[PDB]
Amino acid sequence: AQLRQFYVAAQGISWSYRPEPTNSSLNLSVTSFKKIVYREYEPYFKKEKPQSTISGLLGPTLYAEVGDIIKVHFKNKADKPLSIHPQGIRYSKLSEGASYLDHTFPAEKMDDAVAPGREYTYEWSISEDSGPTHDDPPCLTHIYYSHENLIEDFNSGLIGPLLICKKGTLTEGGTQKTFDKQIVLLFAVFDESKSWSQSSSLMYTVNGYVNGTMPDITVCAHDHISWHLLGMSSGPELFSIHFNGQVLEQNHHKVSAITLVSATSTTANMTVGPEGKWIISSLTPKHLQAGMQAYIDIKNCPKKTRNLKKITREQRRHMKRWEYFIAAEEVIWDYAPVIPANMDKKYRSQHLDNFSNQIGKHYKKVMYTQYEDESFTKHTVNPNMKEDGILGPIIRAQVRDTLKIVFKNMASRPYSIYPHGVTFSPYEDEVNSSFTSGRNNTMIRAVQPGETYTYKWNILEFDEPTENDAQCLTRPYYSDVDIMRDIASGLIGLLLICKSRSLDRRGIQRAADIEQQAVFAVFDENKSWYLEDNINKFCENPDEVKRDDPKFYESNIMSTINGYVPESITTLGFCFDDTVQWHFCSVGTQNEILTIHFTGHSFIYGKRHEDTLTLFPMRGESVTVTMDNVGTWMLTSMNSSPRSKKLRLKFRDVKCIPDDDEDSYEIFEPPESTVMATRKMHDRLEPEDEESDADYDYQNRLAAALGIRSFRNPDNIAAWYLRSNNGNRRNYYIAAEEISWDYSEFVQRETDIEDSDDIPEDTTYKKVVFRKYLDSTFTKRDPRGEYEEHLGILGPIIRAEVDDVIQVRFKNLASRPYSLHAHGLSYEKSSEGKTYEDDSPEWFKEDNAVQPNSSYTYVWHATERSGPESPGSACRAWAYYSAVNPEKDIHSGLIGPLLICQKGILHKDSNMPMDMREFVLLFMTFDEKKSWYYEKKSRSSWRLTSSEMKKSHEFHAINGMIYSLPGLKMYEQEWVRLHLLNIGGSQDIHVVHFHGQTLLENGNKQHQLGVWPLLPGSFKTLEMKASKPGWWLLNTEVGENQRAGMQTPFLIMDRDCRMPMGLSTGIISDSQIKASEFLGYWEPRLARLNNGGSYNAWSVEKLAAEFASKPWIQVDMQKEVIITGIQTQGAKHYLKSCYTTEFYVAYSSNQINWQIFKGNSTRNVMYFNGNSDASTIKENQFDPPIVARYIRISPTRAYNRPTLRLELQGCEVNGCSTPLGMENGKIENKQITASSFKKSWWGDYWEPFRARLNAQGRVNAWQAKANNNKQWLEIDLLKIKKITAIITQGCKSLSSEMYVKSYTIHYSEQGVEWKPYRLKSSMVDKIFEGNTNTKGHVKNFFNPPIISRFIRVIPKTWNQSIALRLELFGCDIY
């Protein structure tokens, strides 16, 4: 419950990018840079903290436990305004530091920009729902920075960690209990060109140190450590950190490489091993050449040395000849193999053969070849094993299988090998570290061209992966001499860290029948060590050497998959009910990443069945696909020209007829023959069939341990295929049709207060967008309700259920063909829509293309592996798009979500899944040069793409529109679901950040993450739990996209928006009640709910016939308000039943453009509902609340006279004018003080302690003792609050009434004082207008709110007495 007070300051530190403690060159410092950073101070800024060395510009580290507060006492000592902005849920509008359009008063604008040489005070509060609190890591990490200028105030060196932790861990010194260290690492890129002192800089630093000049950080050996890896850069960078020789554990995944994208952070743990130096490598092929790393030296502290189990429990020893005698060679390589079916013209007759005498016959291509003999006298296989081809030398490592790597360099250059996540033994280095010790304890890394060598490491059962990880981990191994040059030469393999899966010393696996190796390498011959043996030596046209030319240079860029370019001419055939296991990885001198769409099936991923994998550069991943379909399919990547339409691997999934191995070309080894016949899978040894590795007779010691001991103790067609699926079908009628569409919705009267913003692009653009119609015969559409206001460009949400069956009658209506393609779903090739080779005549090709003005009816089947796993969640998002040309279609607008929810989620609202809010958002940047309707020579510049506005034709949209995206409205403290998707703009990884909010995952039931990184292809379902009302801001915190256009001001409102908007009270005067048609004589100024008299309903003139037309009454508000319901009522004089039954509602913010859609609205199908009898107050609710100035209702069907009385239910503007609790009872009577509890001597007592609005009983107001202009009513709010508005009233006693008429307001500070309320733009006090009638209310507003907890009300001029019932509308500030 403590308060983490913190003193910070910002000063201009002259900072070179390296440290040096000398003199001669340390006065004349040749290189330097101006910088502004964060430096912590002792209280009152007298002294200054030590500022440990390893943190160069990384500012002070803030921290807290769940429950405490933070009072950062900022003080800007630099010469430009600055601020501080953390990440999470805490900040109210005066402690967030960001200055955007949120409609706040000049009081809460001070935190946004602190002038140079001025103080402030930042206060936060770590709630119970912003911390981990469960199986999350012991405690998380967030980055705090400057929000005044997200680009000029970061590269100037303004950043710092914010390390919030879990209740019960953090000590007083700011260090965890069990952990022995608290390290923080800032991988960053400080572009000094976009900085305060704009000088060019090629800086790829870490903490402010370049090329690895950071001083060595060191710890002891065999202890537990805690990491905190930040990362931040203006541009969209990527940091694939790698810990050499060690293993980490983030997110319960025993990973050996942590990936961070810009403006993100994470925490992780590891236990250090024996001593010896190490390196923190950055795997990204760009952060390598640049040069950035650290050093991990390990000391030897004389405290304790552990002694644990060495042998594998004395039974699973497995000590035999299962070592590996690998080597290197330079054999001939055919990228397209010898005489394939699908020949290629480029690589054959221009790059291998002597046809037109290009090179010769030979490629000098190195590869790790595997000899099975020790003496290196024979390869293991010269031909192939019927299904491998180039399945690499498989290195399967498990507990003590005598894994010895014998190595015989037989090449013409120094080479080596280097695995991943494999600690070395000091007998042989197995790494190219600098300090290779002397001849005594030697550690050799390279091998000269002709030598031999011997490595040594056999893993034991001491680093088994977590159960949440995959079955068989996969890791590469390559030549560590020069990575980019050696891998290009062709040195790479797979190192498989499986589990205790050995049944025999041959090493077969279980739980995965068939396995296939697939890596995505890209051999850049221009960076190979045999280009000279390609053009220089072996050649016949070197006459004028082809080089430095776009043709020749890019022609030898051979991006392949397992080397072989053309095709696996044997498509990967399979059986049914099998569980194939795949191993994925990728290398190549290229920064970008890949995503591998898996057409047709899906694979388990942490018990979720995802269908797209984003594999990162130079680190692998393993999946498991199941055979539950029949037909041909694909495995494709889709990023851009060289890889999208190229990387494909066709593979069957079939059997015919029994199991397909009686007369066919897939004879496996069961062999599905007569059951009485012999083959593999039936190898009965002496004892019995496969049980284990045979050992002692019984060896009673057959207990499996826990790992580490628990120690410390007309084409109107329909669907046709739904015959055997036997489904609970659900029908939809989509279409596709052109439309005009311009992203900029703020100039569409959203936030266009300006009048001179010159449009820098085209006015609008012609897209093609999905729609939703009502039946098989079209032209009867379904308009987008209030729910679908934020969809923007996405089609209709196609919802479903587990084990359902979907029928979709797509019907193209555009100029070129289109189609559909689901994801993670089940269908047939005649229900796929993808364009490639099939297994039938153009009968299965009926869906592959939907010609214009026609229609096809797909049949999709959502099975068990297509539903939302991870019981912590409810619905599972997905996507569908026009997959005829998947790159130019999605960039045209044809994209939509496809949700799948569990069994039970659907209400009697057409049975479409409902019962929990959900916003769907597709973060994507739209390119107009990749669409179909891209008129090339636009009217700005025809030569280049608007050379006058270069690259102005790419729009960073947030789900359609830009800067506006209206429709995002949530309550306070309500669980809303979010389906964030990203498949359009691939190479741009996005990180989603809501202001003042903390997201959440499920499955493992707990994950906060602060902000989430959207991987291009992932489908993420999260939960929000909105925090506080006001105008917040949704964006992506990559500073060069937040300013580019990805920022939407979503809205949190109050959680009690149920207050009358003035109809019954009297706020809404009768000067603004209109009517088109009328009912007799009953003036509409008398349409007030619960109004008595003789005429109490709506009319102006006489009707004489009213049953068919739809008259209307129009209420005005004079300001934009919220409306969350309506309170209907019936009228009569003595004998008119006269009630309305059905009635719809319109609304408008301009009185001209009306949106009549809340009657037959979203939750409704095509109707609304109303009253049931005479005066019995009946009310309805607008589930998505509406917000408009004018509102107009129209009754259709009533009882013999369509009358009504209406009363509205809304809230306010800033969005926190909630009842402070007077009438609610949330305030007790001990927060009200005044002068006299005025009593008579022949009657009652006049209580200034019952000033409740609309509370009834005895004298329930404050008639002061004696009349004078010097009484008052003082309210002690018990904590400083923002007092927004006031409502006065009048009182009486059964007789002549009297009431206040005009009052002034004296208020206080935190303490006891009283000061007048001088009008902002005046020189004297402000005067208010009190009541005018007895019971009617009057609302008075404050131009700036009164931020206090003392407030006095001065009755200045009144009517014959002081008397009022009072209610303040305030806000719970902190």
Side-chain angles (χ1 to χ4, degrees):
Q2 214 170 15
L3 80 169
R4 309 285 176 179
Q5 187 174 2
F6 273 104
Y7 287 71
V8 197
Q11 41 198 2
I13 282 180
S14 179
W15 167 270
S16 156
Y17 274 57
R18 269 169 198 188
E20 205 70 19
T22 325
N23 189 31
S24 91
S25 169
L26 269 302
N27 273 326
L28 203 165
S29 175
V30 296
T31 311
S32 90
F33 293 94
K34 307 289 220 71
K35 276 306 203 288
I36 296 192
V37 297
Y38 287 155
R39 290 277 156 276
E40 197 168 3
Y41 278 57
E42 273 198 355
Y44 305 149
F45 295 90
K46 307 292 181 66
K47 192 63 65 68
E48 199 270 325
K49 292 280 190 170
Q51 195 41 264
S52 176
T53 47
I54 70 163
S55 83
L57 301 190
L58 195 163
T61 285
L62 320 171
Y63 48 86
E65 198 167 353
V66 160
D68 301 88
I69 78 167
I70 293 181
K71 280 170 49 61
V72 160
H73 198 98
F74 194 82
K75 179 177 176 61
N76 174 24
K77 294 176 75 173
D79 205 80
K80 62 156 295 182
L82 286 149
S83 45
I84 282 184
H85 180 68
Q87 305 185 343
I89 208 175
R90 289 83 45 181
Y91 32 92
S92 49
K93 272 311 188 178
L94 82 167
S95 166
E96 84 163 3
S99 157
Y100 49 88
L101 270 295
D102 55 345
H103 304 282
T104 75
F105 304 96
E108 275 156 347
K109 312 300 285 183
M110 292 298 104
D111 62 341
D112 307 325
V114 179
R118 283 203 57 217
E119 292 86 353
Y120 194 61
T121 293
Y122 281 79
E123 308 201 22
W124 299 311
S125 159
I126 301 86
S127 43
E128 318 311 295
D129 51 51
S130 43
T133 77
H134 208 65
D135 47 9
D136 277 339
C139 79
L140 310 159
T141 170
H142 321 290
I143 45 177
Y144 85 86
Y145 47 92
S146 159
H147 205 304
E148 189 275 331
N149 202 337
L150 279 195
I151 314 186
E152 197 143 1
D153 285 356
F154 156 73
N155 304 276
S156 277
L158 299 148
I159 190 175
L162 169 71
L163 187 143
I164 284 177
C165 293
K166 176 138 59 165
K167 185 70 177 175
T169 63
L170 193 54
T171 51
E172 62 171 349
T175 45
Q176 290 75 13
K177 288 192 181 65
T178 58
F179 297 94
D180 294 12
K181 298 286 289 193
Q182 175 185 178
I183 311 190
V184 50
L185 258 63
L186 173 65
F187 296 83
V189 165
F190 283 91
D191 180 301
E192 191 67 39
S193 72
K194 322 192 196 72
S195 163
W196 190 58
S197 315
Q198 299 194 353
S199 315
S200 200
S201 50
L202 195 142
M203 282 326 189
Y204 269 57
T205 182
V206 52
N207 289 333
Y209 299 130
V210 185
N211 293 114
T213 308
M214 188 187 82
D216 277 11
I217 185 67
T218 184
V219 300
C220 191
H222 282 168
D223 71 343
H224 188 181
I225 206 157
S226 61
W227 294 97
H228 300 305
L229 308 98
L230 320 180
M232 191 160 172
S233 65
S234 186
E237 304 290 328
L238 174 60
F239 323 120
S240 177
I241 311 312
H242 177 58
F243 278 60
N244 297 271
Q246 276 155 350
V247 306
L248 288 83
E249 184 171 338
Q250 72 167 356
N251 188 77
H252 324 273
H253 270 238
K254 192 76 79 173
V255 61
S256 178
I258 318 302
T259 77
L260 273 300
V261 59
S262 159
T264 323
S265 88
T266 191
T267 179
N269 81 317
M270 79 172 189
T271 67
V272 311
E275 57 270 16
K277 262 171 64 76
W278 292 116
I279 313 91
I280 298 299
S281 297
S282 176
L283 285 159
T284 83
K286 186 55 192 70
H287 287 39
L288 184 61
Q289 264 76 14
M292 53 185 290
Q293 60 198 49
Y295 306 96
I296 311 300
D297 192 0
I298 308 299
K299 292 302 111 177
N300 51 4
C301 55
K303 178 50 161 53
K304 70 181 193 67
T305 176
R306 56 187 54 150
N307 294 154
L308 299 181
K309 200 65 167 180
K310 191 190 182 314
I311 315 289
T312 308
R313 305 199 298 104
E314 309 209 90
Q315 71 163 356
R316 303 284 102 187
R317 290 211 193 118
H318 281 353
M319 36 186 282
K320 195 47 69 179
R321 71 179 294 105
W322 199 257
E323 45 192 353
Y324 292 100
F325 320 92
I326 320 185
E329 286 186 356
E330 49 184 359
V331 296
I332 312 162
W333 191 235
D334 306 329
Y335 276 140
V338 176
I339 306 169
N342 62 331
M343 199 54 250
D344 182 77
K345 189 53 181 313
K346 198 43 175 38
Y347 173 72
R348 198 67 173 88
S349 88
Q350 211 74 79
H351 299 306
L352 270 183
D353 53 56
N354 200 0
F355 305 153
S356 317
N357 41 65
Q358 288 80 345
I359 303 168
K361 176 149 286 305
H362 302 175
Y363 271 173
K364 286 282 173 174
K365 183 66 57 192
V366 177
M367 51 183 277
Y368 284 143
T369 77
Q370 172 169 358
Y371 310 81
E372 71 189 38
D373 179 88
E374 152 65 49
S375 47
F376 299 92
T377 73
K378 57 158 177 168
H379 297 214
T380 196
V381 299
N382 191 3
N384 298 278
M385 279 72 78
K386 91 183 283 186
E387 280 186 315
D388 308 338
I390 196 183
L391 269 66
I394 170 170
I395 302 197
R396 207 187 70 81
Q398 65 93 33
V399 69
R400 198 163 175 170
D401 195 2
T402 301
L403 165 71
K404 184 164 190 173
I405 306 96
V406 190
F407 184 75
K408 180 197 175 81
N409 184 2
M410 304 165 52
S412 87
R413 202 179 182 279
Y415 285 148
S416 47
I417 73 166
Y418 168 57
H420 272 207
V422 170
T423 300
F424 325 110
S425 199
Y427 290 103
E428 277 98 347
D429 216 4
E430 208 173 9
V431 75
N432 201 338
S433 199
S434 159
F435 185 57
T436 76
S437 187
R439 311 302 294 144
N440 309 115
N441 221 315
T442 179
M443 41 179 76
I444 293 189
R445 72 277 192 191
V447 185
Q448 291 289 329
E451 310 183 315
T452 180
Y453 198 63
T454 291
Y455 296 86
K456 177 71 69 66
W457 189 251
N458 50 2
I459 307 197
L460 268 168
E461 61 173 345
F462 68 115
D463 272 326
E464 66 275 18
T466 299
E467 293 177 350
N468 194 257
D469 281 292
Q471 174 215 344
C472 275
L473 294 163
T474 173
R475 299 286 137 83
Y477 66 92
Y478 39 79
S479 160
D480 51 282
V481 183
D482 199 358
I483 298 310
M484 305 287 156
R485 308 293 179 91
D486 290 348
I487 304 191
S489 179
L491 272 196
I492 184 155
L494 276 298
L495 172 144
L496 269 77
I497 307 168
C498 283
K499 286 184 184 295
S500 157
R501 302 304 158 176
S502 53
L503 301 88
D504 213 7
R505 44 204 194 278
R506 54 164 177 263
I508 51 177
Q509 297 92 301
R510 308 139 81 162
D513 294 350
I514 310 184
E515 53 88 24
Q516 293 287 355
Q517 275 79 76
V519 312
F520 304 84
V522 181
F523 309 120
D524 186 342
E525 301 272 38
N526 287 94
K527 295 183 201 64
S528 46
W529 285 129
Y530 287 103
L531 161 81
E532 291 77 9
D533 287 339
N534 287 15
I535 184 59
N536 276 264
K537 176 66 183 294
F538 304 113
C539 198
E540 185 37 44
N541 52 16
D543 53 354
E544 300 173 11
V545 171
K546 318 296 220 302
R547 38 168 154 77
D548 286 335
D549 193 278
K551 167 182 54 59
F552 164 83
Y553 161 63
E554 198 165 359
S555 48
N556 54 268
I557 310 309
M558 202 66 75
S559 65
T560 84
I561 166 173
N562 281 168
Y564 299 128
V565 168
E567 173 154 312
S568 85
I569 191 48
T570 185
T571 49
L572 284 70
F574 284 96
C575 180
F576 213 69
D577 310 325
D578 264 7
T579 166
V580 67
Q581 201 167 27
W582 289 57
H583 308 296
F584 285 94
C585 165
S586 69
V587 297
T589 307
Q590 39 85 29
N591 197 348
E592 41 264 16
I593 71 171
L594 267 44
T595 53
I596 40 168
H597 319 260
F598 212 108
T599 295
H601 318 71
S602 276
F603 44 90
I604 300 170
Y605 205 108
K607 298 313 171 190
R608 282 186 172 92
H609 308 259
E610 271 69 12
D611 208 357
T612 302
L613 199 43
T614 185
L615 48 85
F616 287 96
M618 311 183 70
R619 73 180 186 89
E621 206 161 340
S622 175
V623 303
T624 286
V625 179
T626 313
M627 302 289 99
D628 62 347
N629 222 352
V630 52
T632 177
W633 281 280
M634 204 78 33
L635 186 150
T636 174
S637 275
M638 177 162 84
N639 292 323
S640 85
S641 72
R643 49 178 72 152
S644 296
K645 210 68 60 203
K646 297 297 294 294
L647 278 294
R648 267 174 290 184
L649 180 63
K650 284 90 165 190
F651 72 111
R652 298 184 191 180
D653 211 291
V654 77
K655 25 149 244 293
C656 274
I657 293 306
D659 199 59
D660 196 18
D661 294 346
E662 278 272 82
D663 265 343
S664 191
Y665 315 101
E666 197 197 273
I667 300 193
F668 263 86
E669 55 196 7
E672 212 264 331
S673 46
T674 44
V675 290
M676 302 81 90
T678 171
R679 185 57 186 168
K680 202 66 180 295
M681 312 172 163
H682 183 114
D683 61 273
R684 267 177 58 179
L685 274 51
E686 323 95 308
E688 210 198 0
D689 208 339
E690 284 158 325
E691 55 179 358
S692 43
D693 208 27
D695 279 323
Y696 299 103
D697 181 58
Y698 190 24
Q699 65 151 347
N700 200 326
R701 195 158 168 159
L702 259 171
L706 283 76
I708 296 281
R709 181 178 173 178
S710 278
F711 199 73
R712 208 192 81 200
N713 51 2
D715 302 0
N716 50 0
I717 60 158
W720 196 33
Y721 176 77
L722 180 46
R723 272 63 206 158
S724 176
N725 289 284
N726 304 6
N728 320 307
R729 67 169 56 108
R730 204 161 309 204
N731 303 316
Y732 306 83
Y733 308 79
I734 311 298
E737 40 202 353
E738 293 84 342
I739 201 180
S740 195
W741 163 268
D742 50 348
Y743 311 76
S744 80
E745 208 271 335
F746 79 98
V747 290
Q748 303 173 217
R749 187 49 282 160
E750 208 59 60
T751 64
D752 194 56
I753 310 92
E754 56 269 63
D755 313 278
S756 198
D757 42 5
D758 293 29
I759 175 168
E761 298 105 335
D762 190 10
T763 62
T764 173
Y765 297 86
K766 180 186 175 176
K767 301 281 202 200
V768 285
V769 191
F770 280 146
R771 302 289 298 188
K772 208 266 200 194
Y773 287 68
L774 274 168
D775 41 351
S776 316
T777 54
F778 284 38
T779 61
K780 187 67 174 67
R781 53 210 303 175
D782 168 54
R784 294 284 196 76
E786 305 284 351
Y787 278 177
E788 295 94 7
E789 192 65 25
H790 63 75
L791 286 192
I793 201 164
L794 272 65
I797 296 182
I798 306 196
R799 269 167 272 242
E801 203 181 10
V802 166
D803 196 75
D804 275 24
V805 166
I806 308 178
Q807 292 174 210
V808 188
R809 307 180 182 72
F810 171 77
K811 176 179 164 78
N812 186 327
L813 311 166
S815 314
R816 77 183 302 272
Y818 294 118
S819 286
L820 273 71
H821 188 245
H823 265 78
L825 211 55
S826 306
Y827 40 89
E828 281 311 307
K829 178 58 85 75
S830 161
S831 312
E832 178 171 308
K834 264 300 178 54
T835 321
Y836 53 73
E837 291 77 19
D838 65 349
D839 69 282
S840 91
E842 298 185 357
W843 177 13
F844 287 172
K845 272 168 176 164
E846 209 174 336
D847 65 332
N848 284 57
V850 170
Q851 301 161 349
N853 279 320
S854 193
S855 41
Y856 202 41
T857 74
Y858 305 99
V859 174
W860 297 338
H861 178 38
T863 174
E864 44 181 29
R865 62 103 160 172
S866 195
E869 322 283 338
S870 276
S873 198
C875 296
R876 199 256 172 285
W878 267 332
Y880 66 99
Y881 43 77
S882 195
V884 75
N885 177 277
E887 289 285 25
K888 294 191 78 67
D889 280 22
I890 306 180
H891 267 86
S892 315
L894 294 159
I895 183 65
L898 160 57
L899 273 79
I900 309 280
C901 310
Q902 64 193 2
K903 275 293 211 319
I905 307 305
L906 80 172
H907 201 80
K908 289 218 162 193
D909 292 309
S910 171
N911 300 91
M912 295 299 105
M914 292 300 173
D915 310 337
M916 181 193 179
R917 313 207 57 164
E918 45 168 14
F919 304 82
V920 180
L921 296 163
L922 180 66
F923 289 83
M924 179 180 172
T925 180
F926 281 89
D927 227 348
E928 122 125 315
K929 301 179 272 289
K930 296 190 58 68
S931 183
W932 287 121
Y933 310 90
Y934 178 68
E935 193 257 7
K936 192 261 293 180
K937 37 189 62 176
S938 200
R939 289 321 184 261
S940 308
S941 177
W942 318 305
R943 184 81 51 68
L944 206 74
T945 172
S946 281
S947 159
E948 268 73 358
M949 312 285 189
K950 299 209 191 305
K951 294 299 185 293
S952 45
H953 298 248
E954 173 196 342
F955 300 104
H956 318 265
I958 302 183
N959 181 9
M961 304 167 186
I962 287 174
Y963 282 159
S964 317
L965 203 61
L968 310 175
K969 290 169 202 151
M970 298 99 74
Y971 278 127
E972 170 185 8
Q973 297 288 340
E974 58 154 343
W975 281 111
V976 302
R977 189 177 311 149
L978 283 152
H979 302 283
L980 312 183
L981 310 169
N982 188 13
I983 197 57
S986 309
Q987 291 309 335
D988 215 318
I989 283 177
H990 273 113
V991 290
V992 196
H993 170 39
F994 293 76
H995 268 63
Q997 314 305 135
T998 44
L999 302 96
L1000 181 65
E1001 206 194 1
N1002 294 79
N1004 221 354
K1005 198 51 68 153
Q1006 169 54 248
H1007 269 88
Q1008 297 309 305
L1009 277 293
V1011 304
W1012 178 267
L1014 257 185
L1015 278 303
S1018 198
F1019 320 108
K1020 203 54 188 179
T1021 169
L1022 304 162
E1023 312 210 1
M1024 174 67 86
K1025 191 81 172 296
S1027 79
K1028 280 179 55 62
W1031 276 104
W1032 293 119
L1033 182 46
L1034 160 62
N1035 67 293
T1036 177
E1037 66 272 58
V1038 180
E1040 285 177 11
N1041 289 116
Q1042 180 264 8
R1043 183 201 161 182
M1046 284 200 186
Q1047 48 179 354
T1048 303
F1050 75 117
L1051 184 65
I1052 314 289
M1053 38 200 57
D1054 181 65
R1055 179 191 129 198
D1056 268 325
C1057 284
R1058 288 188 63 255
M1059 62 181 215
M1061 287 303 305
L1063 266 298
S1064 314
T1065 72
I1067 313 303
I1068 298 297
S1069 158
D1070 60 356
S1071 316
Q1072 54 264 20
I1073 315 296
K1074 318 295 294 177
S1076 46
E1077 183 65 26
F1078 317 110
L1079 323 159
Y1081 200 85
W1082 305 16
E1083 293 291 329
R1085 35 170 187 79
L1086 306 175
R1088 310 294 179 90
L1089 180 134
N1090 274 333
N1091 168 280
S1094 159
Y1095 307 80
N1096 50 354
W1098 149 50
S1099 175
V1100 175
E1101 289 322 298
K1102 292 277 276 292
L1103 60 88
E1106 171 43 58
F1107 65 96
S1109 281
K1110 308 142 281 189
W1112 52 256
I1113 184 169
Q1114 161 177 332
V1115 190
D1116 181 9
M1117 301 301 175
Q1118 303 150 349
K1119 69 185 189 75
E1120 197 84 352
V1121 307
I1122 310 181
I1123 294 153
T1124 82
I1126 194 62
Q1127 275 195 318
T1128 61
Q1129 200 182 47
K1132 88 198 194 62
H1133 49 96
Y1134 75 98
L1135 210 67
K1136 203 155 78 75
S1137 318
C1138 196
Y1139 42 101
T1140 308
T1141 50
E1142 178 167 0
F1143 79 106
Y1144 60 83
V1145 176
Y1147 64 89
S1148 156
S1149 279
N1150 52 71
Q1151 209 165 347
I1152 285 171
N1153 216 16
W1154 301 82
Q1155 210 265 348
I1156 307 105
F1157 284 100
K1158 202 54 201 72
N1160 42 2
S1161 170
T1162 63
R1163 189 198 154 107
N1164 308 332
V1165 174
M1166 285 306 286
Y1167 306 95
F1168 207 86
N1169 199 325
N1171 208 339
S1172 159
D1173 64 347
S1175 87
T1176 78
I1177 293 93
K1178 150 83 163 185
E1179 61 93 20
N1180 309 125
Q1181 294 299 344
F1182 302 165
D1183 164 69
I1186 74 182
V1187 53
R1189 183 174 179 176
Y1190 311 90
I1191 180 167
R1192 163 194 292 177
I1193 71 170
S1194 288
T1196 75
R1197 260 165 36 190
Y1199 214 88
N1200 79 27
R1201 291 293 182 186
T1203 49
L1204 64 95
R1205 272 184 290 182
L1206 76 164
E1207 165 68 284
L1208 284 87
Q1209 290 192 6
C1211 25
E1212 245 240 290
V1213 43
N1214 24 94
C1216 84
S1217 297
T1218 179
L1220 273 184
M1222 297 295 113
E1223 67 280 19
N1224 286 332
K1226 214 180 311 168
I1227 296 314
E1228 313 91 4
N1229 207 1
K1230 297 323 289 165
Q1231 310 208 353
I1232 296 154
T1233 174
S1235 196
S1236 64
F1237 304 164
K1238 178 280 149 183
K1239 196 119 181 347
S1240 156
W1241 204 64
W1242 273 33
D1244 42 351
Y1245 44 86
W1246 269 110
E1247 321 86 325
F1249 46 102
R1250 289 197 197 282
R1252 303 295 212 265
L1253 285 183
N1254 312 316
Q1256 286 73 10
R1258 216 201 189 174
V1259 291
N1260 59 346
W1262 156 51
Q1263 192 165 343
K1265 216 167 169 184
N1267 261 338
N1268 55 7
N1269 57 75
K1270 286 160 274 187
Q1271 286 282 111
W1272 29 263
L1273 177 51
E1274 287 160 15
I1275 294 87
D1276 172 21
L1277 267 190
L1278 171 149
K1279 54 158 58 62
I1280 46 167
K1281 290 180 192 182
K1282 164 195 177 182
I1283 321 179
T1284 304
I1286 184 179
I1287 291 191
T1288 302
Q1289 210 181 8
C1291 189
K1292 59 162 171 313
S1293 160
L1294 79 152
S1295 186
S1296 88
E1297 203 271 336
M1298 66 288 287
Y1299 56 97
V1300 194
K1301 275 184 173 178
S1302 177
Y1303 57 73
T1304 53
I1305 287 288
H1306 302 158
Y1307 71 97
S1308 156
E1309 73 278 6
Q1310 278 65 10
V1312 169
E1313 202 59 39
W1314 306 115
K1315 72 181 76 65
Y1317 187 84
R1318 170 184 259 183
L1319 172 49
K1320 37 177 304 177
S1321 54
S1322 70
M1323 313 83 78
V1324 289
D1325 296 332
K1326 182 189 283 189
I1327 196 71
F1328 293 104
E1329 294 276 60
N1331 279 74
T1332 55
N1333 48 357
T1334 167
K1335 189 72 65 187
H1337 304 174
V1338 62
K1339 184 172 275 287
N1340 286 281
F1341 282 85
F1342 308 114
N1343 293 318
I1346 296 188
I1347 296 171
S1348 175
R1349 63 104 170 183
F1350 288 162
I1351 167 164
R1352 179 199 261 175
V1353 177
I1354 286 276
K1356 275 287 199 169
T1357 49
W1358 62 86
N1359 171 30
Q1360 217 177 39
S1361 95
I1362 307 312
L1364 64 89
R1365 286 177 291 276
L1366 166 56
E1367 199 280 336
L1368 308 188
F1369 283 131
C1371 201
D1372 197 299
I1373 212 72
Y1374 208 67

